[PDB]
Each structure stands twice: as structure tokens, then as C-alpha cells.
Amino acid sequence: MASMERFLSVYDEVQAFLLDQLQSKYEIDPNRARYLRIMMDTTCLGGKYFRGMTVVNVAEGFLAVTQHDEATKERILHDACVGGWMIEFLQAHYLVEDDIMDGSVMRRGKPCWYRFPGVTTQCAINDGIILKSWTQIMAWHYFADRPFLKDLLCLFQKVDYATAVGQMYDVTSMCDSNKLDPEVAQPMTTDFAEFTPAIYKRIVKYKTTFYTYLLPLVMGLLVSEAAASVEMNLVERVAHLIGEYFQVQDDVMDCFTPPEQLGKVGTDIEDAKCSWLAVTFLGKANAAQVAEFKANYGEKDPAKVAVVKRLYSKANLQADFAAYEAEVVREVESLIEQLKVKSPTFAESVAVVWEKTHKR
């Protein structure tokens, strides 16, 4: 059975399981089950499933070099699919809540879940909470007798917490740290002193890399009972490195990729986000260019947003991206080589993850 096909068939099984359990144990009625079914489909499907499929791809790599009965191969693949959906549902939780938090309009060329006429923020915040609760229901049901259940739940929790901390780093990236105070309305920074590569690296590390790369790779190892085939410090170092490049790609696209291709209108400039473009620009601009940046950043006014985009285009950030990319390619290659010592199989899965990121 083809990988994607198996993955999508497991979604249907998981959905039927969750919805039946709501009927048999939670006294749900058909209309509320239908609402939750549509919520699940609208928030979980439509993407590329890169995170979920990485779990499956990692498990597939190990099956090719390990002796198992056919029933065990089927069990491992089914577990990798459930594991993959746990991450997809975790991401769905993040996207639903992030969209509400940011007042976002579109997500994947469709309205944000909370903007659906029969949803509203009052329901959507709770819908987002349910999405994350379902990841745990999945784990406890499907992995009840598995030796990896403990490690898997512990990893999932640590990743989820790191991601929430990352979201806090992201939402507060445009204010002066020394001014943070629940009692006082937060002014946007005027000096941009915290728009540095190391501060940018911290936001990205926590907000994206743990759930997008570390969690699918390690979950693939856990379901395969293969964590001994790797040096965990290398897995962490390669996940953070690929994850950072992925976010740099996200940041560049928000500013220059057409809204129809991106699936929404990018607002990082208006939002005064600490993006790779803002940081890199400030790392090479002259005094006059820094003044022009300060006068126009973090403003809704389309004329001010156009000035910032013009500063980025004239600063030749395309060259800085090419240099950054060459250094990442270099470091990713080094780590893949280091991973080959313990597992050529896992190194290959990482090579495929990198290829899919670099070529997207």
C-alpha cells in the first residue's frame, strides 16, 4: 500500500473512532458530532501533511532493514500513521488558536476556522482545545499496550510546551523586553535592538522547529523502537538547523510570495514581526536606511508597508539568503554524515526531509 494512501485511510479510521466514542461515552447527539466532524476536516486537512508523513517515511526506512512478521510491519506502519496524525492535529490546534490570536482572515485560501458564520471565536477557541485533546485520546487508545507510550507522551508534552513558549516569544517579538508588563499597554519597539540573529533564532527554534522537525523524526524512531540507532544530540542539532531554514523560507514568502500562492495576505511588516528579512536588513543597512525602516515598520498604512518592501528589495537580501542557504546546506550535509555512523537508514530519511524542505 502507497504511503500517502495508508496515511489518509488512517485519518478516516481515527475520525470514526473519535466520533463513535463521543456517541458511546460522551452522550453526543448527531448534530454536534457532525459539527465536530466538519471542524476536524476543515482544521486538519488541506495541507501537504509533511509533518505526519515524516513519521511514516522514518518508520518505512527502518522496516526495509529490520526483520519483522508481516503483522508487525502492518502494526508499525499503522502506529506511524496515528503518530503522524497526532502531530497534524497538534498543528491544527496551533493554527486555529494562532489565527484567532492574530485576527487572521485566510488560511490555505479559505477563511480561518473562527470566521466561519456558524463557528465564531466563542466556539473556535474551544474547538482548538478539542483538537489538542484528540491527540491524547489517539495516543492512549491506539498505543495503550505499546512499549513506547511513555516516551512518546513525554516527548509530545515537551514539544507542545516548547511550541507554546515559542508562540509567546513570537507574539512579544516587537516589544522591548524591559517594558513587558501585564499592567501596561505594550508599545512597539523604537530602537529594534532586539531584532538580532540570536533573538530571531530563539523565536524560530521554539515556535516551529520542535513540532515541525524534531517531533516527527523522533516519533518515527519511537514507533520503530529505533532510538538506539541514533545519537539524540545530532537529531536535535539537525532538526533545529532544518527548522530554522524552513522558517526563513516562511518569512521570505510572507513578504514576496503572491497571496493566491501563499493562501493568505502576508502581514509580517504591519505586525512588526521579527522576521529574517527585518533582522538581515538591519544587519547591513546604513544609518539613513535604518531611519527609513524605523519610520515605516509595524504600520497598517499600505504606503509604509510598500516603503519597507522597497528597502528589502534594494538591500539585496536575495544574496544574503543565498549565503545563508549555502551555509545551511553545508551544516545539514555535515550532520547527515555524522548520523551515517549509527544509521545510514535514518541519515537517508533526514536527507529526504531536507530535500523536501530545500526544494519546496
Added chain:
Amino acid sequence: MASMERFLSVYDEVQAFLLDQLQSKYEIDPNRARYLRIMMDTTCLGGKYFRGMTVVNVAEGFLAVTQHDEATKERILHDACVGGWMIEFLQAHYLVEDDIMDGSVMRRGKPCWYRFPGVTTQCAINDGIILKSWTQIMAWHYFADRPFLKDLLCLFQKVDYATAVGQMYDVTSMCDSNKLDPEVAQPMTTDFAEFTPAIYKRIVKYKTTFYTYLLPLVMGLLVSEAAASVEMNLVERVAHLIGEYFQVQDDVMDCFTPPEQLGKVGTDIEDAKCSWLAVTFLGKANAAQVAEFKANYGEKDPAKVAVVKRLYSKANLQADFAAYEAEVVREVESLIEQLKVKSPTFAESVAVVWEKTHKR
């Protein structure tokens, strides 16, 4: 050491642990640690700690009749306090998100967390997510080597999911089930056919009783390694019964308790909530009274809200509450007697939980 005193000292220890870990492992800066410290204090403290203290009280009951070394007694009490804080932090998550979802103004006579000038909804939604993540960090750290960790995490997850389902039941309690649709803006019910005792019992069962009564009682049993001293079906039956009475008390207070004593202005009528008052009133009103109810319920207009309150006061719902209360007292007494068969100690803890609920 006095119970409440030990409980509050454990909060300080847990807070120091979480904040230090953010510094040592999550690269947090002092200003963001301070923000999270104030968030923790504002959202977790100020209440009666009834839920957290029930865990402690249950564990204390068993210590009085069980042989242990002094170090083991200290361990059990410390675990009961951490367990109690997990529930208090779970409730803090619920209250933060519920307040945002409802557009609430005050909570415990203070502004809702999201209304703090330096917080806003953009941060508060994520702050609420962090509160729940901290319950898991607590469990994995403090109970790492405990035999009850698995059962405790499994119970906590099931309770959290039931509570989120309950919140969905609550937020949709004023619409017609057959009209629920994410694509269509939801009209408020006109017939109130779903304002029945059994539908009211379902909302209350899931939205409050699992986390307010079942979870503290069972957590007290888990930390004591005493789940064999009880018949779990009785614990579930007594928790649902006390929990329902607690919510009936909440519903009555929202309408008749002064805002200064309640800690907020009650809006159940304006919100068209399926409250015990609305259900009980519709269960005894004549055709003319039902028409007057339909014409005035679920409206912001203070004149319409005053009409509904006048219908409740003239319907003599105080007598219906007295009859309901007498039946609950009767059923709670029966279940306590049934619990005495396996554990007079646990039956006594339940007797104390009931007394604290009935006399509040």
C-alpha cells in the same frame, strides 16, 4: 504542618521550579519570566482552592489509617499538593479561555486576565494554553518515578476532554441542535424544546462535575495508592450528584447573588444559558408565562432581563430548589453509606466534600 499552609507552600515551590526550568532549558529572559510569574499568580490564586484541597484532604484521610515511615507520609502529602495544583492550573486554563470566549469583564472582583492592558487576547489565549501545559510539566517532573503516573495522566486527559466537550455543550445550549452548522450563523432557539432537565444534566455533568469533583477525589485515591479501597462506579455516581448540585447553586447565584459577592455581573439570562432556573421555570409555567419567557430571554436589554427575573421570583423557584436539595441530600447520604462498605475513611472525605458544597 496545617493542610492549607502546606498546599500554598507547594505552589511557591512549583512556581520556582517552572520558572527556573524556563531559564535553564527554554532560554527565557527575566522580563518574560516575570510576565509568566504574574500570569500564574493572577490566574491560579485568589479562589478557595476547593478542588486542590480535596486531593490533600483525601490523602490526609488515608494517612491517618495506614502504616508509613515519616518520609513516606511527607512524600504522599507533597504529591497530593502537586496533584491539587495540577487541577487548580487546569481550572485556571478553563477560566482564562472561557472569559475570552464569553467576552467576560470581571473574574473574582478583578478584570479578566485578557483585559489587563499589557496582556490582550493575542497573548491571553496562549497564556491559557501554557497554564494547561504546566499541569503536564508538573506531573512528569514530580511523579517521574511514581507507580500512579500512568493512571494519573490517563485520568487527567479523560477529565480534560470531558470538560472541553462540556464547554461545547454549554456554548451551544441556546441553539436548536438540528440547526447547528459551521456554514450558517446560529440563531437562538425560539421553542426552548431543548431546555429540559436531562439536557441540563448533560451540560453540567461534562462541563463541571468531572474536573470539580471526580478528578480531585480520584487523584486523592491515586496519590494514596488507595483506588482498591473504593468501588469506582460509586465514586463516579457521587461526584456527578454533588457536581450537579454545585452547578445548580452556581446558576441560582448568577441571577440572585449581588455582583460584589459573586465577583462579577451575572449574564446567564442575556446569554440565553440553559440554566437550572430557565429549565425549572419552563417545567412548571402556564402557556402565558412561557410566552412572556420567550419574548424576553436571551436579550441584552435590562428591561427584558428584569422581566425574566420577575418570572423566576413569582414562579416560586425557591421551593423547587428546596425539593431538589432534599432529593440530593437523600441520594448523597445513600451513596456515602454505600461507600462505607469498602472505606469509612473515603466515605468521610466525601461527607466533608458534600458539607463544604452544601454550606457554601
